Design an enzyme around this catalytic site. Structure first.
Site, PDB file in Angstrom:
ATOM      1  N   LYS A  55       4.567  13.320   0.649  1.00  0.00           N
ATOM      2  CA  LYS A  55       5.277  13.092   1.817  1.00  0.00           C
ATOM      3  C   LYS A  55       6.390  11.848   1.677  1.00  0.00           C
ATOM      4  O   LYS A  55       6.136  11.173   0.865  1.00  0.00           O
ATOM      5  CB  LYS A  55       4.072  12.841   2.891  1.00  0.00           C
ATOM      6  CG  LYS A  55       2.921  13.670   2.878  1.00  0.00           C
ATOM      7  CD  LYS A  55       2.156  13.395   4.113  1.00  0.00           C
ATOM      8  CE  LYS A  55       0.881  14.317   4.204  1.00  0.00           C
ATOM      9  NZ  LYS A  55       1.259  15.337   5.294  1.00  0.00           N
ATOM     10  N   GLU A  67     -10.971  -0.775   8.925  1.00  0.00           N
ATOM     11  CA  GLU A  67     -12.049   0.408   8.142  1.00  0.00           C
ATOM     12  C   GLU A  67     -12.969  -0.442   7.175  1.00  0.00           C
ATOM     13  O   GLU A  67     -12.549  -1.395   6.640  1.00  0.00           O
ATOM     14  CB  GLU A  67     -11.206   1.388   7.427  1.00  0.00           C
ATOM     15  CG  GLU A  67     -10.146   2.409   8.174  1.00  0.00           C
ATOM     16  CD  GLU A  67      -9.103   2.902   7.347  1.00  0.00           C
ATOM     17  OE1 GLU A  67      -8.803   2.189   6.051  1.00  0.00           O
ATOM     18  OE2 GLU A  67      -8.887   4.058   7.643  1.00  0.00           O
ATOM     19  N   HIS A 123      -2.380   0.213   6.913  1.00  0.00           N
ATOM     20  CA  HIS A 123      -2.505   0.299   8.388  1.00  0.00           C
ATOM     21  C   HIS A 123      -1.939  -0.908   9.121  1.00  0.00           C
ATOM     22  O   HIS A 123      -2.278  -2.290   8.725  1.00  0.00           O
ATOM     23  CB  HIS A 123      -3.877   0.334   8.839  1.00  0.00           C
ATOM     24  CG  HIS A 123      -4.422   1.588   8.181  1.00  0.00           C
ATOM     25  ND1 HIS A 123      -4.235   2.974   8.218  1.00  0.00           N
ATOM     26  CD2 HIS A 123      -5.783   1.649   7.405  1.00  0.00           C
ATOM     27  CE1 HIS A 123      -4.653   4.004   7.258  1.00  0.00           C
ATOM     28  NE2 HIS A 123      -5.649   3.048   6.918  1.00  0.00           N
ATOM     29  N   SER A 170      -4.331   9.462  -1.066  1.00  0.00           N
ATOM     30  CA  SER A 170      -3.185   8.572  -1.053  1.00  0.00           C
ATOM     31  C   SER A 170      -3.294   7.108  -0.729  1.00  0.00           C
ATOM     32  O   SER A 170      -4.533   6.521  -0.387  1.00  0.00           O
ATOM     33  CB  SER A 170      -2.152   9.202   0.294  1.00  0.00           C
ATOM     34  OG  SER A 170      -2.848   9.122   1.483  1.00  0.00           O
ATOM     35  N   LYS A 218      -6.159  -0.107  12.632  1.00  0.00           N
ATOM     36  CA  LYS A 218      -7.202   0.780  11.876  1.00  0.00           C
ATOM     37  C   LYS A 218      -7.927   0.133  10.845  1.00  0.00           C
ATOM     38  O   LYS A 218      -7.905   0.288   9.636  1.00  0.00           O
ATOM     39  CB  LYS A 218      -6.304   2.005  11.443  1.00  0.00           C
ATOM     40  CG  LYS A 218      -7.602   3.208  11.179  1.00  0.00           C
ATOM     41  CD  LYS A 218      -7.076   4.324  10.512  1.00  0.00           C
ATOM     42  CE  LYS A 218      -8.130   5.414  10.740  1.00  0.00           C
ATOM     43  NZ  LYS A 218      -7.654   6.820  10.334  1.00  0.00           N
ATOM     44  N   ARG A 259       2.064   5.447   4.375  1.00  0.00           N
ATOM     45  CA  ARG A 259       1.862   5.664   2.944  1.00  0.00           C
ATOM     46  C   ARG A 259       2.470   4.850   2.008  1.00  0.00           C
ATOM     47  O   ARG A 259       3.614   4.467   2.316  1.00  0.00           O
ATOM     48  CB  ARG A 259       1.969   7.012   2.739  1.00  0.00           C
ATOM     49  CG  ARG A 259       0.970   7.918   3.116  1.00  0.00           C
ATOM     50  CD  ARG A 259       0.953   9.515   3.499  1.00  0.00           C
ATOM     51  NE  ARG A 259       0.683  10.194   4.671  1.00  0.00           N
ATOM     52  CZ  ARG A 259       1.171  10.404   5.751  1.00  0.00           C
ATOM     53  NH1 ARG A 259       2.696  10.100   5.812  1.00  0.00           N
ATOM     54  NH2 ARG A 259       0.685  11.084   6.759  1.00  0.00           N
ATOM     55  N   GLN A 276      -2.608   3.807   1.273  1.00  0.00           N
ATOM     56  CA  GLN A 276      -2.357   3.653   2.516  1.00  0.00           C
ATOM     57  C   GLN A 276      -2.276   2.302   3.003  1.00  0.00           C
ATOM     58  O   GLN A 276      -2.786   1.392   2.544  1.00  0.00           O
ATOM     59  CB  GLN A 276      -3.404   4.515   3.339  1.00  0.00           C
ATOM     60  CG  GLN A 276      -3.482   5.836   2.941  1.00  0.00           C
ATOM     61  CD  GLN A 276      -4.487   6.580   3.999  1.00  0.00           C
ATOM     62  OE1 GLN A 276      -4.822   6.358   4.967  1.00  0.00           O
ATOM     63  NE2 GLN A 276      -4.498   7.797   3.990  1.00  0.00           N
ATOM     64  N   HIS A 290      -4.383   0.146   0.022  1.00  0.00           N
ATOM     65  CA  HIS A 290      -5.644   0.553  -0.370  1.00  0.00           C
ATOM     66  C   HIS A 290      -5.796   2.259  -0.682  1.00  0.00           C
ATOM     67  O   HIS A 290      -4.736   2.650  -0.048  1.00  0.00           O
ATOM     68  CB  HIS A 290      -6.802  -0.010   0.394  1.00  0.00           C
ATOM     69  CG  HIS A 290      -6.783   0.929   1.874  1.00  0.00           C
ATOM     70  ND1 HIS A 290      -5.694   0.048   2.721  1.00  0.00           N
ATOM     71  CD2 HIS A 290      -7.288   1.795   2.450  1.00  0.00           C
ATOM     72  CE1 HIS A 290      -6.054   0.987   3.787  1.00  0.00           C
ATOM     73  NE2 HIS A 290      -6.882   1.816   3.708  1.00  0.00           N
TER      74      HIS A 290
HETATM   75 ZN   LIG Z   1      -7.371   2.928   5.374  1.00  0.00          ZN
END
Ligand SMILES: [Zn+2]
Length: 392
Positions: A281, A135, A100, A96, A133, A275, A98, A256
């Site tokens: 969802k 990453e 953050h 998916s 978050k 998302r 996403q 991303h």
């Molecule tokens: Zn991510």
């Protein structure tokens, strides 16, 4: 023992590859489960384990009984736990899109949602915790991803062929700026019924007359998400093919998606995911939009530029939650030290770790935990070792 060989958990999420961890590392999978993530850390849903004395104990529990010695004082005082999860990600289908949120908005959103008694395991629960978050992904095999908005002139070029898909595309083409990009992004995700079907039809026809990227990536995604408004996202977001050994940082407020291949992923401790498509969802479009920075990132700034010092290749990260480096191994030992706990992972070759009298061998795919009190360790062998740690 000083150095602790990790017993790690494999998440058999339905989207995982049945073969990647076996092909790479010889990890067993006779029952042919999807093997989606190999987790290296202290996550409460499934901590890695260490061997004490005979028995095994949860890393999370071991750290909780001895936070300063294990994490080091800086990390213990800042975070109060191991502040990252390190994983091998093996994406056998596209995942998916996403976003953050940043730390401040995560704190604001976590509260909002508490102060309206939203159930944790509910559909509309955007903020599961008040953490950001950040990453990093580091490619183990060629790794296809989307990350960040394209330069506006690039978006314009790519949208021409599908201008008739939706009035918001025409609107952006008329004046291609951040406001109209935001409106476009939101309109696409909000498309419904005949509006959505018309848009998808125009896009699918474009795949017949437009060749090369990102049209090819849309084709690949359409195998798994044929009726998703996220099929337009490769025209707005950069499509990047990371070669093995290349890395990218996933900034806050930045859409991303991980599309194909195998990567190491290092992530702060958060489950905050807004998302932005390629998902069945419910998506909260207003909350998504309020947490996206509509600012192009040009292609040449997407990858993290590492710095090589001796045997160490450091990948500078603009957060405190984690740091990440690669270490070349040779016959002559190299010292690997840090103020924090570290996890060391054998990418390729074979690593001999030594701390005084203790010797620990890692084959590709295996990892060890080094507590702060046990730094430094000496490494030799062949190939490369990846390290997740904290630079505070
Ligand atoms: Zn991510």
């Amino acid at each position: 023992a000083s150095m602790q060989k990790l017993i790690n958990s494999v998440q058999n999420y339905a989207w995982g590859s049945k073969t990647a961890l076996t092909e790479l590392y010889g990890i067993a999978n006779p029952q042919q489960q999807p093997m989606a993530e190999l987790w290296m850390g202290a996550h409460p849903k499934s901590s890695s384990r260490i061997t004490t004395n005979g028995e095994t104990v949860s890393l999370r529990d071991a750290i909780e009984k001895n936070k300063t010695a294990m994490l080091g004082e800086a990390v213990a005082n800042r975070f109060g736990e191991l502040p990252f999860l390190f994983a091998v990600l093996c994406a056998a289908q596209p995942l998916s899109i996403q976003v953050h949120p940043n730390k401040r908005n995560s704190e604001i959103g976590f509260a909002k949602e508490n102060a309206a008694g939203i159930p944790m395991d509910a559909a509309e629960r955007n903020y599961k915790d008040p953490n950001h978050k950040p990453e990093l992904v580091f490619a183990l095999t060629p790794f296809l991803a989307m990350n960040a908005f394209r330069e506006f002139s690039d978006i314009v070029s790519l949208l021409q062929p599908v201008a008739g898909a939706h009035s918001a595309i025409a609107h952006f083409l008329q004046v291609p700026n951040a406001e109209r990009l935001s409106q476009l992004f939101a309109s696409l995700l909000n498309m419904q019924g005949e509006e959505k079907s018309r848009a998808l039809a125009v896009l699918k026809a474009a795949l017949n007359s437009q060749q090369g990227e990102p049209w090819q990536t849309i084709r690949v995604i359409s195998e798994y998400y044929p009726d998703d408004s996220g099929l337009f996202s490769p025209l707005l977001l950069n499509v990047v093919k990371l070669n093995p050994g290349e890395a990218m940082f996933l900034f806050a407020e930045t859409p991303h998606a991980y599309l194909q291949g195998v990567a190491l992923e290092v992530m702060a401790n958060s489950d905050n995911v807004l998302r932005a498509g390629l998902t069945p969802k419910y998506i909260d479009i207003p909350e998504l939009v309020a947490n996206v920075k509509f600012e192009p990132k040009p292609a040449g700034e997407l990858l993290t530029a590492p710095v090589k010092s001796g045997a160490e290749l450091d990948f500078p990260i603009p957060v405190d939650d984690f740091a990440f480096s690669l270490h070349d191994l040779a016959l002559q030992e190299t010292s690997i030290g840090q103020h924090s706990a570290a996890i060391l992972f054998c990418v390729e070759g074979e690593a001999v770790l030594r701390k005084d009298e203790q010797r620990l061998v890692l084959k590709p795919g295996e990892s060890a935990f080094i507590g702060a009190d046990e730094s430094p360790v000496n490494a030799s062998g062949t190939g490369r070792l990846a390290r997740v740690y904290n630079k505070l």
